[PDB]
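Can't attach files on this board, so I'm pasting raw text. These are the components:
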Amino acid sequence: FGNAGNYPHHQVSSFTFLQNYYCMYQQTNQGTGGWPCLAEHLQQFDSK
Amino acid sequence: VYIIPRPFSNFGKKLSTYTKSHKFMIFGLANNVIGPTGTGTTAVNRLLTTCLAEIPWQKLPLYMNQSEFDLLPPGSRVVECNVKVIFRTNRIAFETSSTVTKQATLNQISNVQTAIGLNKLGWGINRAFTAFQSDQPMIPTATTAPKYEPVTGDTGYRGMIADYYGADSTNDTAFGNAGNYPHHQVSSFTFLQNYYCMYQQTNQGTGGWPCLAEHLQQFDSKTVNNQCLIDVTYKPKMGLIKSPLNYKIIGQPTVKGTISVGDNLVNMRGAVVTNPPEATQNVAESTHNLTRNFPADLFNIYSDIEKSQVLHKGPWGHENPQIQPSVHIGIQAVPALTTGALLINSSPLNSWTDSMGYIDVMSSCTVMEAQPTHFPFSTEANTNPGNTIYRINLTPNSLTSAFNGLYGNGATLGN
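---
Top answer:
Structure tokens for the assembled complex are below.
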């Protein structure tokens, strides 16, 4: 509420971020072979 | 009647396919002020340079990675393999600096240029990776052995393979906040580390710079933009890419009565051949050829990492007692360098605006094979001399494509 505190955003159009991005896990020795291929599981367009 | 039906062992043929979307980047290397002899060995010679970046559609890794290669059965041969590229776009700098010279501009005039056969077929050499210049830094300076495999003066740079695929779940040098990334596997741009140029020395032979311009096409980039300008393919004349199949020694008389000599009067040609042009001259050349014929069967590869080994081996792998010739075509994509707006006083043209092109390239190939066996207790895959395959060995490199033709590749190492 406040000049400056936690805003109704949605209720009054506001941008807000998508606070999570995604990634892949993998360790070292208890199992191993390389980074699989994301590229063949998500499509890419020329944005514009 | 009643025929008792014979046996049969039909060994099937594995036939795979591979693809990969590489995102390559080129720079508009300023029509490369020719660099004199890259080596203190050929010292008096030079390289007229182009920005024509080289797409390695001949080095196995452009198509498949470690494993896929790794797992190919013996006798595995690449059937055909293709590349198509799209001028996804190019980017040119914006001088803020006013500095120098180079007047700042929102203008932009750039132009793509592609070319095919030149490489192999014409009069040039792929000599790249380089060593170069400060602002108005697109012309370059140190020639160098073209890099496909990884290079190192103990520190190392490169790894085509690893550039596209990253390291091993354990390998240190990569994996890391900051070390050798899976790129391909997770879309990344990477550069086309080789550009192409032409060699030529001074006095033992002479007449001027031939005309590249009439051996590569040029488009107004923006026009050709986001449209694919490459798509040529090669069906290697002989692409046995894994150690061949061993013919087994279990027939009968003399052919295993003993391991002696079993030779015979055939009256048909059966050995690989050789041209040795005797260039000798006194003000423009005088040549002489001498066909040399030679042997056959020892192996094809070893280090296993000889995936970074060449593709079409038409000049050395004679399959069975016979013969043949030919070279994998070659292919280049790029943008002629954007000239600085060097006002008034430029009456030399030598100021060059940094510009980088993002070319989108997809590579694919087939390679396939069988795993037959004709002997009941024979261990390995096995065939017969009927084909067995045969290599032809030599002291130095066999056809070292990293140094210009005479159509086939001379077998000696340049620069």
